[PDB]
C-alpha cells in the first residue's frame, strides 16, 4: 500500500485533493491496477498453502484413527520400534502424539539350525527358532530370549 505504481503518490486523498478529475482518474487507475495485482497474488499463495495444511490434517486424522484407537502393524507409522499405544495432546493449531514403543536390547549370539532329526523324521518349530547355549538345544521366540 506504500507503492505508487508509477503514479505521483501512494495516497488517494492527495491525488483527489490537488488534481482535477481527468488526470486524477488516470493516477487512480495506475494505483488500482497495482493493488489488484497485490491482492490476487496474496489469494493465490493462500490457496496453495491451504492445500498443504489440508494434506497434513488428513495425515493427522489417519494417525489418530490407527494409533490412538488401535494398535498398528505398519512400520514407522507411529514412532520407532514396535508400537504399543499412543496418546494425543492438543497444541496451538495442531496435535502432538506421544507414541509408546517396545525396543529390544542386549542381544546374544547363538548357534541355530533349521530343523532337527529325531528318528528319520524332520521336526520344524511352530513359533520361534532352535538355539544352542553350549550344552543343549532349546526353542525361543524371536524378540525375547526365553528357552523352552
Amino acid at each position: 500500500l506504500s507503492s505508487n505504481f508509477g503514479a505521483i503518490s501512494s495516497v488517494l486523498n492527495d491525488i483527489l485533493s490537488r488534481l482535477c478529475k481527468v488526470e486524477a482518474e488516470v493516477q487512480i487507475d495506475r494505483l488500482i491496477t497495482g493493488r489488484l495485482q497485490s491482492l490476487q497474488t496474496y489469494v493465490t499463495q493462500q490457496l496453495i498453502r491451504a492445500a498443504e495444511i489440508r494434506a497434513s490434517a488428513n495425515l493427522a486424522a489417519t494417525k489418530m484413527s490407527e494409533c490412538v484407537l488401535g494398535q498398528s502393524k505398519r512400520v514407522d507409522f507411529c514412532g520407532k520400534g514396535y508400537h504399543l499405544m499412543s496418546f494425543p495432546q492438543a497444541a496451538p493449531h495442531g496435535v502432538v502424539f506421544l507414541h509408546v514403543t517396545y525396543v529390544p536390547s542386549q542381544e546374544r549370539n547363538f548357534t541355530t539350525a533349521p530343523a532337527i532329526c529325531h528318528e528319520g523324521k524332520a521336526y520344524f518349530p511352530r513359533e520361534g527358532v532352535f538355539v544352542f547355549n553350549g550344552t543343549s538345544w532349546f526353542i525361543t521366540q524371536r524378540n525375547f530370549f526365553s528357552p523352552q
Binding site: V103, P104, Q106, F110, T111
Partner: peptide
C-alpha cells in the same frame, strides 16, 4: 550361515 542374534532385554 549358522548363527543368530537374539535380544535378552527391552
Amino acid at each position: 550361515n549358522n548363527t543368530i542374534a537374539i535380544p535378552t532385554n527391552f
